Structure formats: structure tokens, C-alpha cells
Short mmCIF file of C-alpha atoms and ligand atoms in Angstrom, two decimals:
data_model
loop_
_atom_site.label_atom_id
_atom_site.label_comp_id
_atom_site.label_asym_id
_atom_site.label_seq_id
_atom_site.Cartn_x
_atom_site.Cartn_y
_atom_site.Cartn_z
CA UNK N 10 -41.40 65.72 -112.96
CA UNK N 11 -40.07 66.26 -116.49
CA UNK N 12 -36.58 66.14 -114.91
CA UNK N 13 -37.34 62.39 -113.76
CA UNK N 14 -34.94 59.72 -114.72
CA UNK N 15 -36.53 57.82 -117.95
CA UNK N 16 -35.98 54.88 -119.42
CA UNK N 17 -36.21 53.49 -123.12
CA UNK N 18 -36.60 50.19 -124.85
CA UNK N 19 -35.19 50.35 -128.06
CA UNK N 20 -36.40 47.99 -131.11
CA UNK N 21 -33.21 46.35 -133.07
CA UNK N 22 -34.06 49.00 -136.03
CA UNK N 23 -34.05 51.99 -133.32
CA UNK N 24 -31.03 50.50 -131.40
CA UNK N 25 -28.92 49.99 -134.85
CA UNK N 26 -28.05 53.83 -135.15
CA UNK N 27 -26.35 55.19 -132.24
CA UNK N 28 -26.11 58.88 -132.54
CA UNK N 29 -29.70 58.70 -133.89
CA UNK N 30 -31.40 56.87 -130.88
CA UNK N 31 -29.56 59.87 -128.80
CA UNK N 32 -31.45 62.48 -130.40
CA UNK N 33 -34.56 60.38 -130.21
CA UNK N 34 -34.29 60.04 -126.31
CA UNK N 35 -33.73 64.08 -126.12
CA UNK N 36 -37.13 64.68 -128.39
CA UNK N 37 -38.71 62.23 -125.71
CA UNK N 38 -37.10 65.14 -122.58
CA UNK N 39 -34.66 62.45 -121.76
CA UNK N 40 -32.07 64.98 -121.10
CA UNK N 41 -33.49 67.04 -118.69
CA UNK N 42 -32.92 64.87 -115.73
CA UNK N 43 -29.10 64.42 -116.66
CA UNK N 44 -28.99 60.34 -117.12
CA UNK N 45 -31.54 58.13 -119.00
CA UNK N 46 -31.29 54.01 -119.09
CA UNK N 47 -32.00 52.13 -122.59
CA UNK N 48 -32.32 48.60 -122.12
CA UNK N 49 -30.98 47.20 -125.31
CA UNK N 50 -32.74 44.62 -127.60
CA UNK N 51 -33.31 41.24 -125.87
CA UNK N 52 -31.27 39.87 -129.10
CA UNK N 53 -27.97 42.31 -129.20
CA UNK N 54 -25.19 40.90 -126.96
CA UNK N 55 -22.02 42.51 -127.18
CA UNK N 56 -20.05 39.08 -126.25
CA UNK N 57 -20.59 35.72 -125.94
CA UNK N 58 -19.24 34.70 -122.85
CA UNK N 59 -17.45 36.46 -119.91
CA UNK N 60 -15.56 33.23 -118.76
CA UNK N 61 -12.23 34.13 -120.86
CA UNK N 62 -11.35 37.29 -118.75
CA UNK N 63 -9.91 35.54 -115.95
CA UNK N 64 -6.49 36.62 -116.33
CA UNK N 65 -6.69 40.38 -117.75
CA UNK N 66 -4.65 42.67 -115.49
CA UNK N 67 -6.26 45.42 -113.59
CA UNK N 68 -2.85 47.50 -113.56
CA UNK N 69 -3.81 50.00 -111.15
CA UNK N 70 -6.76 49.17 -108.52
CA UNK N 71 -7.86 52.26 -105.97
CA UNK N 72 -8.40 51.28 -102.17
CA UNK N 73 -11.66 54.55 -101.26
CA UNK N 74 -10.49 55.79 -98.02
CA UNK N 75 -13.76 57.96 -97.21
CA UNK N 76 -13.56 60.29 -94.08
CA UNK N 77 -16.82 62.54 -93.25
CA UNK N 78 -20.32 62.71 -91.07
CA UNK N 79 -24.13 64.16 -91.70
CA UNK N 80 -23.98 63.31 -95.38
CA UNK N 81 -20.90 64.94 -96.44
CA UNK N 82 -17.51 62.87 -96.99
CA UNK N 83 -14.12 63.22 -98.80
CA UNK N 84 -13.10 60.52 -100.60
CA UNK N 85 -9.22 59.59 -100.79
CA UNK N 86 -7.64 56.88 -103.43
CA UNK N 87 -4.57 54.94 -102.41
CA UNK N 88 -3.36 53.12 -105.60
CA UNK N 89 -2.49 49.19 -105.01
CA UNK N 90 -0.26 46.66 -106.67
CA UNK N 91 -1.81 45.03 -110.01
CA UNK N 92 -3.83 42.10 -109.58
CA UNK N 93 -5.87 39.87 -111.84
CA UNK N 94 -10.43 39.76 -112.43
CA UNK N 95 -9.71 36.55 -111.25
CA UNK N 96 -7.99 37.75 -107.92
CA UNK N 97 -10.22 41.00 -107.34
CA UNK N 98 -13.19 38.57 -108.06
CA UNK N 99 -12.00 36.56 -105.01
CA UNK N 100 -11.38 39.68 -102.44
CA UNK N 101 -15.44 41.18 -103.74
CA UNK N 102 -16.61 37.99 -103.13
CA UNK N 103 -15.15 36.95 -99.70
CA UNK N 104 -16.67 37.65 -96.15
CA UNK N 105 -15.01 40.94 -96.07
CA UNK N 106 -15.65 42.93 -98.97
CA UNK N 107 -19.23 40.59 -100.47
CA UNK N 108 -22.30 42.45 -100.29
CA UNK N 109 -24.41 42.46 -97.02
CA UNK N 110 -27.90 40.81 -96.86
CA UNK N 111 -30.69 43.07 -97.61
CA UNK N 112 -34.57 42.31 -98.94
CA UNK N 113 -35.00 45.84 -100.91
CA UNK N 114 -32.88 48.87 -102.42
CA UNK N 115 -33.60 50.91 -99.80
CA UNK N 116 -32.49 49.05 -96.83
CA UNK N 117 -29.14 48.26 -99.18
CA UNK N 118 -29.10 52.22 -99.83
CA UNK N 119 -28.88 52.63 -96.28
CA UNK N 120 -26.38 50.43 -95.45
CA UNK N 121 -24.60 52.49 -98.51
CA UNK N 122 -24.66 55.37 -96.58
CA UNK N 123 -24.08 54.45 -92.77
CA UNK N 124 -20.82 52.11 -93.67
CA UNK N 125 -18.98 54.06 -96.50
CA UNK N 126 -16.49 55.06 -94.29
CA UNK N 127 -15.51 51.48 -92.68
CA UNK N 128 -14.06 48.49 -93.88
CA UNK N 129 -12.40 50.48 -97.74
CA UNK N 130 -13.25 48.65 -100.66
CA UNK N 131 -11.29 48.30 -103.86
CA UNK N 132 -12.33 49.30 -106.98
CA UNK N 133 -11.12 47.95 -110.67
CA UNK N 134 -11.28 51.60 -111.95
CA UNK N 135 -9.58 53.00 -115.32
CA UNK N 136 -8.79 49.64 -117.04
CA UNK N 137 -7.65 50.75 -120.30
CA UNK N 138 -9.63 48.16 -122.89
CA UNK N 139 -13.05 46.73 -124.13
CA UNK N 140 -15.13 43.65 -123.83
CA UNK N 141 -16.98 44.15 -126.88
CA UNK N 142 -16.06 41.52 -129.51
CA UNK N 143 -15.03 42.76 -133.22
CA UNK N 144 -18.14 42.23 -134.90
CA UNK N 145 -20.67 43.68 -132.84
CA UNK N 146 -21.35 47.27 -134.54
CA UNK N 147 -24.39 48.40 -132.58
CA UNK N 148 -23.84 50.68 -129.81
CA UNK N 149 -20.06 49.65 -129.33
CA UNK N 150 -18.16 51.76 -126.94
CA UNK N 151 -14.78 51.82 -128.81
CA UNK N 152 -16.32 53.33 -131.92
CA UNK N 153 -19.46 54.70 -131.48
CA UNK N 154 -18.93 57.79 -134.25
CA UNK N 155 -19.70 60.67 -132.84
CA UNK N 156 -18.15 64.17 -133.75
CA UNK N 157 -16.29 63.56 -130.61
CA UNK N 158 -14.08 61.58 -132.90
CA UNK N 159 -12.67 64.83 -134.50
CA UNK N 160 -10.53 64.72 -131.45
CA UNK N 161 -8.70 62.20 -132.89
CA UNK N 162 -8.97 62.33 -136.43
CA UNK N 163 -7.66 66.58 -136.77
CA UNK N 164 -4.97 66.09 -133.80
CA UNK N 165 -4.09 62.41 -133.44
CA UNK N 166 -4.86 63.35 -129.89
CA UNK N 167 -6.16 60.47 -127.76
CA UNK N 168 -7.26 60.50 -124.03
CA UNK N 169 -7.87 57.59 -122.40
CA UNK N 170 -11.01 56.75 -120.99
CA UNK N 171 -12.96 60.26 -122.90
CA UNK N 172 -12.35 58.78 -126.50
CA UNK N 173 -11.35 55.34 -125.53
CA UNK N 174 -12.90 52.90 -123.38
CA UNK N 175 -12.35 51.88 -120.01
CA UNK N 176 -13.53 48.92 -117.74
CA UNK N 177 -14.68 49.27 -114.18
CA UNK N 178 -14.46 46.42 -111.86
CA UNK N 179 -16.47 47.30 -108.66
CA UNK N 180 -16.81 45.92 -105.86
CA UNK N 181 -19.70 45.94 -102.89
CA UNK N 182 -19.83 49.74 -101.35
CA UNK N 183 -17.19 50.81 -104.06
CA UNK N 184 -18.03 54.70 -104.92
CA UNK N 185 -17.97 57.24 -107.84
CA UNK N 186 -18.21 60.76 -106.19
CA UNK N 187 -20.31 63.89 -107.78
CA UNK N 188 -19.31 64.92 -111.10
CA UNK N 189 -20.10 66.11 -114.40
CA UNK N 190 -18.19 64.48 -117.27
CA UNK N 191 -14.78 66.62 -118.34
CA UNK N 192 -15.61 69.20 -120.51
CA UNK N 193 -19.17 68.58 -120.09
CA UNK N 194 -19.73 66.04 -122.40
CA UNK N 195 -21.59 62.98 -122.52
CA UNK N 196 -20.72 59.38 -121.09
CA UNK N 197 -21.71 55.67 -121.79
CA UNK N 198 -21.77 53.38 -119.40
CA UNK N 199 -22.56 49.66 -119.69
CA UNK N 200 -23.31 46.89 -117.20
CA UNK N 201 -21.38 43.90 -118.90
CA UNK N 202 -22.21 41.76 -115.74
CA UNK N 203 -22.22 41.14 -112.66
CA UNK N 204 -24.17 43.27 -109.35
CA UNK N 205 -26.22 46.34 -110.09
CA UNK N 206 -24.49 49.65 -110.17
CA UNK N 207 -26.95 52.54 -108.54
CA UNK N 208 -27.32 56.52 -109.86
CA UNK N 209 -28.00 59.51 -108.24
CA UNK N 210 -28.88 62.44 -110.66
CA UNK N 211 -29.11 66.01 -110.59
CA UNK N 212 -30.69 67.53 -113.55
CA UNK N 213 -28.89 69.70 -115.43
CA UNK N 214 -31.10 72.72 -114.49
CA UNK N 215 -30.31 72.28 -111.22
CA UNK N 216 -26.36 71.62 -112.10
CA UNK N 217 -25.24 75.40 -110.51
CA UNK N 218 -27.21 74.87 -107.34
CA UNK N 219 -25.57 71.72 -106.46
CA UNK N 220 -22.16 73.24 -107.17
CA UNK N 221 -23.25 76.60 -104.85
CA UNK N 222 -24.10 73.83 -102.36
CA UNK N 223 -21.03 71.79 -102.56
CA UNK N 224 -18.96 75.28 -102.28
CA UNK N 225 -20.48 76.16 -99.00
CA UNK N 226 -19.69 72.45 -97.51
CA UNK N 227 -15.98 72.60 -98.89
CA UNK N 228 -14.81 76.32 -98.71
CA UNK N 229 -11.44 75.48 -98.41
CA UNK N 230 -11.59 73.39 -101.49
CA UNK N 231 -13.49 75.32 -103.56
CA UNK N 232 -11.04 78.27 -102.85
CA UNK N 233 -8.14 76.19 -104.26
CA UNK N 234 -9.91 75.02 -107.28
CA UNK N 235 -13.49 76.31 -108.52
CA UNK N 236 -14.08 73.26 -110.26
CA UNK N 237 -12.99 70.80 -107.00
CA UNK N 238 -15.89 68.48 -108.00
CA UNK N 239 -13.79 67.44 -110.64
CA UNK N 240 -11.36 66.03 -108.43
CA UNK N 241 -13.79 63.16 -107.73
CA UNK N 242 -13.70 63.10 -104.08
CA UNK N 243 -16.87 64.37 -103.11
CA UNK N 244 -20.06 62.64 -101.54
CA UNK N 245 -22.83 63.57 -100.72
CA UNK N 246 -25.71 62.16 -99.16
CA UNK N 247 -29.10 62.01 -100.62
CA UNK N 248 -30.48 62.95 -97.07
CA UNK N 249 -28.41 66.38 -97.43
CA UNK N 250 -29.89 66.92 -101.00
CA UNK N 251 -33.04 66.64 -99.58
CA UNK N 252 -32.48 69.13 -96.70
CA UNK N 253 -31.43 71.93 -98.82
CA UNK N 254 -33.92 71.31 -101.58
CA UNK N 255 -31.98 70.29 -104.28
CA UNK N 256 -33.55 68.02 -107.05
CA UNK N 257 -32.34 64.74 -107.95
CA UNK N 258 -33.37 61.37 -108.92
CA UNK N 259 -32.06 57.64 -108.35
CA UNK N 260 -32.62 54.55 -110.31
CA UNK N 261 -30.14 51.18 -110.34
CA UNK N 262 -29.00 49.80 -113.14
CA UNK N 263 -28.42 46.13 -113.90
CA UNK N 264 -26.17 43.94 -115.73
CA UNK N 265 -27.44 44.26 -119.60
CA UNK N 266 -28.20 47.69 -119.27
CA UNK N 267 -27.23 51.08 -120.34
CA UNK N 268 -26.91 54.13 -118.90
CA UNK N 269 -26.23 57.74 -120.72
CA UNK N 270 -25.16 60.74 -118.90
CA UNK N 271 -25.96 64.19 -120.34
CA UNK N 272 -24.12 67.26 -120.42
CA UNK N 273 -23.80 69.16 -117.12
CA UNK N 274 -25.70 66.11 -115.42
CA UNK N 275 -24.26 65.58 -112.13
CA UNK N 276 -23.99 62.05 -111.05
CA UNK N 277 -22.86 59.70 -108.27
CA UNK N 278 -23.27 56.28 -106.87
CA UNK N 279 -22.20 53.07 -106.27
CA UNK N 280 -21.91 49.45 -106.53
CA UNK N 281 -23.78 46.44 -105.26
CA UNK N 282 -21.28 44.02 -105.02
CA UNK N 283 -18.59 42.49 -107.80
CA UNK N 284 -19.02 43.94 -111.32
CA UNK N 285 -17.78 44.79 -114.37
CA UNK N 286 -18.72 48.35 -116.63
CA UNK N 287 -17.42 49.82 -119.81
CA UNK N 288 -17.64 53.83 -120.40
CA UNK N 289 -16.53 56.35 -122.38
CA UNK N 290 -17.55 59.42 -123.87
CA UNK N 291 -19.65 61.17 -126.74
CA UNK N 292 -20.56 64.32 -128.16
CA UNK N 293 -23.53 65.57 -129.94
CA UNK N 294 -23.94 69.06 -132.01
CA UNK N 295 -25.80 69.60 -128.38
CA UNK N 296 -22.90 69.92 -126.62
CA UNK N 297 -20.63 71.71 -128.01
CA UNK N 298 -22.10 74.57 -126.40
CA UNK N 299 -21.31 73.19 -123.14
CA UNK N 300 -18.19 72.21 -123.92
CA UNK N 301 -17.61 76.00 -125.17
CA UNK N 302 -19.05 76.84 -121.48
CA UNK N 303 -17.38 74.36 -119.60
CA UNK N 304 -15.01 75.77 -115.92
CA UNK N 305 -12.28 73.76 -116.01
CA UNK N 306 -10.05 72.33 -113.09
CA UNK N 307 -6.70 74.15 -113.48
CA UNK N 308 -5.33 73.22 -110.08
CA UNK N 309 -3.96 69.60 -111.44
CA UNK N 310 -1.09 69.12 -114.37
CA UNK N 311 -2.79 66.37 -116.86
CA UNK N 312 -6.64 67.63 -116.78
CA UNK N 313 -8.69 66.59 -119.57
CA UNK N 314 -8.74 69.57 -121.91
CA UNK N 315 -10.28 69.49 -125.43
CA UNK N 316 -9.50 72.23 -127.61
CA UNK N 317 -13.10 73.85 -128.80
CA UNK N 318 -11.47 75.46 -132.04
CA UNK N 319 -12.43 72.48 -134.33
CA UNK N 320 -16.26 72.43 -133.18
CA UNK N 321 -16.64 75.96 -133.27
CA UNK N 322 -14.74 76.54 -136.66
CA UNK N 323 -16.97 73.43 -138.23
CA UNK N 324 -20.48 73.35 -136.74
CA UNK N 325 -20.31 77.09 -135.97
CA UNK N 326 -18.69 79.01 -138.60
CA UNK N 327 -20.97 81.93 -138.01
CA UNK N 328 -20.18 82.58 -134.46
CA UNK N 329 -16.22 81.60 -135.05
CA UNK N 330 -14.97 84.99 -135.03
CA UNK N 331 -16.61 86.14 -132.54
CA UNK N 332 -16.08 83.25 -130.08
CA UNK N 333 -12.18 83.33 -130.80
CA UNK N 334 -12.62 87.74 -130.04
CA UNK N 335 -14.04 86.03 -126.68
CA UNK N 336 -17.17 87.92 -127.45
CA UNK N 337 -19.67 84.87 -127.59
CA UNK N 338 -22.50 85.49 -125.56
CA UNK N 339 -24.67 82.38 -126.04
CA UNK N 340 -26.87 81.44 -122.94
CA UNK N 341 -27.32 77.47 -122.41
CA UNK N 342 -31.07 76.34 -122.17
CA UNK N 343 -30.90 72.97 -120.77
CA UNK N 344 -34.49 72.08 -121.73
CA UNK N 345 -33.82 72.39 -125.80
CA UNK N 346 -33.39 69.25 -127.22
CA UNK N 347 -30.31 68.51 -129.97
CA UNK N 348 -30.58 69.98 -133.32
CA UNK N 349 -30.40 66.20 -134.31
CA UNK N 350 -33.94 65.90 -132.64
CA UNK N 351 -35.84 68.03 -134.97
CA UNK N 352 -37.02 64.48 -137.15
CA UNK N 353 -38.52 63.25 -134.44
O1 5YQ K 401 -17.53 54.19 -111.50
C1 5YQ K 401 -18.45 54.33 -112.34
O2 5YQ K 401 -19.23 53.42 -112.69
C2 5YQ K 401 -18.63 55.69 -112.96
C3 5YQ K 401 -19.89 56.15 -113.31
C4 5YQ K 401 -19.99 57.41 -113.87
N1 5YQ K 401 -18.95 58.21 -114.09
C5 5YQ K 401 -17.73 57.76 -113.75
C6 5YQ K 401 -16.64 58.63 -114.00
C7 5YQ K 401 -15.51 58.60 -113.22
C8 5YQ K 401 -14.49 59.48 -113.52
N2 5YQ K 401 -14.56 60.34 -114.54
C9 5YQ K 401 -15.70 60.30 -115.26
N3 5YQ K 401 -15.81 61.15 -116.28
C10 5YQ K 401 -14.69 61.92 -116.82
C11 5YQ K 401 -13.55 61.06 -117.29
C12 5YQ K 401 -12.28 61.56 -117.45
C13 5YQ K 401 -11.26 60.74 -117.88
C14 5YQ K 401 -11.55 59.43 -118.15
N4 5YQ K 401 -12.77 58.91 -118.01
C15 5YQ K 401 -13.74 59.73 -117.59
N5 5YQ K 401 -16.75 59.48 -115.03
C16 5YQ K 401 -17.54 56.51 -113.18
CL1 CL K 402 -41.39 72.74 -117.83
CL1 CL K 403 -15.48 33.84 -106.28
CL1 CL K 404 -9.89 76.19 -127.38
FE1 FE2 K 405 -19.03 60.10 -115.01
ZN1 ZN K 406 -8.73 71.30 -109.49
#
């Protein structure tokens, strides 16, 4: 109830300071369902036309192979050759891959779930780059300035896609599986145009029970890495949720729109037919508890790992020594909202 999906409408005043508006949203409970939507100001446009994007390469587009039954699949990326927007645009689009006729979101939902393993789509996914223009210096994902930034600016050390920006180019029925962001932090995620892009959420709360859940589904995975939900190749059905009693929430989100994950917020969903999304992520003094907390996937070589020293040492000093003994005790409460909030 207090864990439901909310949404915001920022004024242009609100909407102006980014790390602000965050910790408004988390005085308002936002957090506690693990994603929010803020519709941005009727005014704000990050860029004037999406015409001139024809010819950007997508260097590395991902056929989803998904193989499963009752509400539980495995989902399996086979890389392609590079194409062009203006060439995936014409492969979403055709007969094959366009989006099937439906009247509402639940008879599309359904379809979702009885034909995700036929006919594999191809998603856009990873595009290093933005579509922000230069100018535009409210809520721009390529330099939002967050502390997150001290990633970059005490170890030159830049990961693609966690403090840079990527561009998703989906497709009807193209997936994103289960997950919490890598080292538990926050994501952005906008809707430059194109088909809506749908959300499943599990609040935070209710982050361990999911994982116990997904454990007992995928034994043999979960043996080989604790933290196989990072992989990214897990789905699971609403209808399973359900049967085991596991919160969660949906919502859709259209072209124009944001959505924010929180920390430990598990997500998933999909897309409605040919679109176009820019992400990255963000911190807050919120999470670098999490972050702290966070059980990593070990199992794979290049794993997005962010050294806590710098947060701890900085926003912490008090509990440094400790922490680096290994003798930091702090317990997470997922309902507390960012110190950040306390103005509001
Ligand atoms: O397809 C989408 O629209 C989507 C939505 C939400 N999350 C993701 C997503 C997919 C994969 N990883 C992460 N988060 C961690 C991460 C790690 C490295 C680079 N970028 C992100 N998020 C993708
Ligand atoms: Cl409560
Ligand atoms: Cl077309
Ligand atoms: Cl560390
Ligand atoms: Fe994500
Ligand atoms: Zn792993």
C-alpha cells in the first residue's frame, strides 16, 4: 500500500535540481516500492528532434533466446552483426517483429507472457552515447552530479553504462530480466520516444524474498553464483509472484517519461514495440549503505565493482575504521528516507 508504485509531476523550479527532487520523492515514501515515475515539465525537452539519428550504429544488438514454462524462463543473448536505428527500425516495425493488436495493457501483458519464448526479438541494448543535446542542464543523464561521480573524479575510473549513459533500442516483446542495479545503486531511465516500456517492481522490503524464491526455482544456478540474478537471465512471471505471495507492482511508462529505480528494487519488464531509452546510474548519501551491503557476482571476469573506500572514508569517517576492521554492523531499514530528505 505504501510500497505502491508512485508517480510525481514536477514544476520547472522542482525539476531544475536533480539530486534535490530525489530526496523530495523519498520524503513523499517514493522509495519503498523500488521504482517511482516523474513526468517532467510539459516545457523541458531534452532534444529537438529525433529525425537526425538515422544512421548511429548500434554496434552490438542481442537476439533473447528465452527457454522455460509455468512462469519461469532463462533468458539467453546471442550477439548479432552491427546494424543502423534506421535498419533495426525497419526489422521492429515489419510483420514479424511489430507489435500485435491489442485494445488494453492487460490483454498486451498476456500476449507478453504466452509468446516470450517464440519468434526472438532483437534488442538495441548497451549503446554507448546520449541523445540529450549540450545545453539542456536539467535532469541530463550524462552529468547528473551525484556523489556517484567520485568514481570518476578520485580514480579516473569509468564504467560504461553505471557512470555513463547508454541507449536502448527495443523492440516489441524485447525483455530486461529481474535485477537490482550493480552494487545496489540507483538507475535513470528515460523514454526518448517511441512504444511504452512496462515495469514490474518488487519493493525493496521484499528484495530477500524474491531472491529466496528465485534460489529455489534455479538451484543449480544459484549454487554456481549467489548473486545469479545478476546475470540478467531470469524471468519470472507475475502469475508465479502471485502464487507464492510475493509483493510487487506494475505500471508502463511512456515516451516523455521517467522512471527511477531505487536501491535493492528489483525490476523487470519489457517493451511494447520499437523504442528508444537512455539510463544510467546515481547515488545518494542513501545508498552508500547498500552499496557497503551489496553480494556481488564473482562467478564472471569484468563485474561491475565499485570500490566503497572513498564513500565510507568521506561521508562516514566515524564508522571508517571500523568498516575497513570488517566490524561494521549497520542494519539497512528500507523504509528511512535519505538524509537529503530531512528539508522536506
Ligand atoms: O532494458 C531496459 O530498459 C532496462 C531497464 C532497467 N534496467 C536495465 C538494466 C539492464 C542491465 N543492467 C542494469 N543495471 C546494471 C548495469 C550494469 C552495467 C551497465 N548498465 C547497467 N539495468 C535495463
Ligand atoms: Cl508501514
Ligand atoms: Cl519503419
Ligand atoms: Cl572496497
Ligand atoms: Fe536496471
Ligand atoms: Zn555470477
Amino acid at each position: 500500500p505504501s510500497a505502491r508504485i508512485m508517480t510525481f509531476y514536477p514544476t520547472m523550479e522542482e525539476f531544475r535540481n536533480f539530486s534535490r527532487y530525489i530526496a523530495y520523492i523519498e520524503s513523499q515514501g517514493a522509495h519503498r516500492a523500488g521504482l517511482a515515475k516523474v513526468v517532467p515539465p510539459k516545457e523541458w525537452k531534452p532534444r529537438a528532434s529525433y529525425d537526425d539519428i538515422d544512421d548511429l550504429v548500434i554496434p552490438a544488438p542481442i537476439q533473447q533466446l528465452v527457454t522455460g514454462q509455468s512462469g519461469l524462463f532463462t533468458q539467453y543473448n546471442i550477439q548479432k552483426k552491427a546494424m543502423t536505428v534506421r535498419e533495426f527500425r525497419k526489422i521492429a516495425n515489419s510483420d514479424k517483429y511489430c507489435t500485435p493488436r491489442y485494445s488494453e495493457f492487460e490483454e498486451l501483458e498476456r500476449k507478453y507472457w504466452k509468446n516470450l519464448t517464440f519468434n526472438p526479438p532483437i534488442y538495441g541494448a548497451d549503446v554507448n552515447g546520449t541523445l540529450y543535446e549540450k545545453h539542456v542542464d536539467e535532469w541530463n543523464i550524462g552529468r547528473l552530479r551525484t556523489i556517484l561521480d567520485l568514481v570518476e573524479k578520485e580514480s579516473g575510473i569509468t564504467i560504461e553504462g553505471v557512470n555513463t549513459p547508454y541507449l536502448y533500442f527495443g523492440m516489441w516483446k524485447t525483455s530486461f530480466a529481474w535485477h537490482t542495479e550493480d552494487m545496489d545503486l540507483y538507475s535513470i531511465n528515460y523514454l526518448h520516444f517511441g512504444e511504452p516500456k512496462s515495469w514490474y517492481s518488487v519493493p525493496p522490503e521484499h528484495g530477500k524474498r524474491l531472491e529466496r524464491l528465485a534460489k529455489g526455482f534455479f538451484p543449480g544456478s544459484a549454487q554456481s553464483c549467489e548473486a545469479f540474478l545478476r546475470h540478467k537471465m531470469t524471468l519470472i512471471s507475475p502469475l508465479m509472484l502471485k502464487k507464492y505471495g510475493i509483493p510487487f507492482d506494475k505500471v508502463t511508462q511512456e515516451a516523455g517519461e521517467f522512471m527511477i529505480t531505487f536501491p535493492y528494487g528489483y525490476h523487470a519488464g519489457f517493451n511494447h514495440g520499437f523504442n528508444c531509452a537512455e539510463s544510467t546510474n546515481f547515488a545518494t548519501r542513501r545508498w552508500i549503505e547498500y552499496g557497503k551491503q551489496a553480494v556481488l557476482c564473482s562467478c564472471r571476469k569484468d563485474m561491475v565493482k565499485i570500490s566503497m573506500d572513498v564513500f565510507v572514508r568521506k561521508f562516514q569517517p566515524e564508522r571508517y575504521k571500523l568498516w575497513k576492521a570488517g566490524k561494521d554492523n549497520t542494519v539497512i531499514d528500507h523504509t528511512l528516507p535519505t538524509p537529503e530528505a530531512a528539508e522536506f
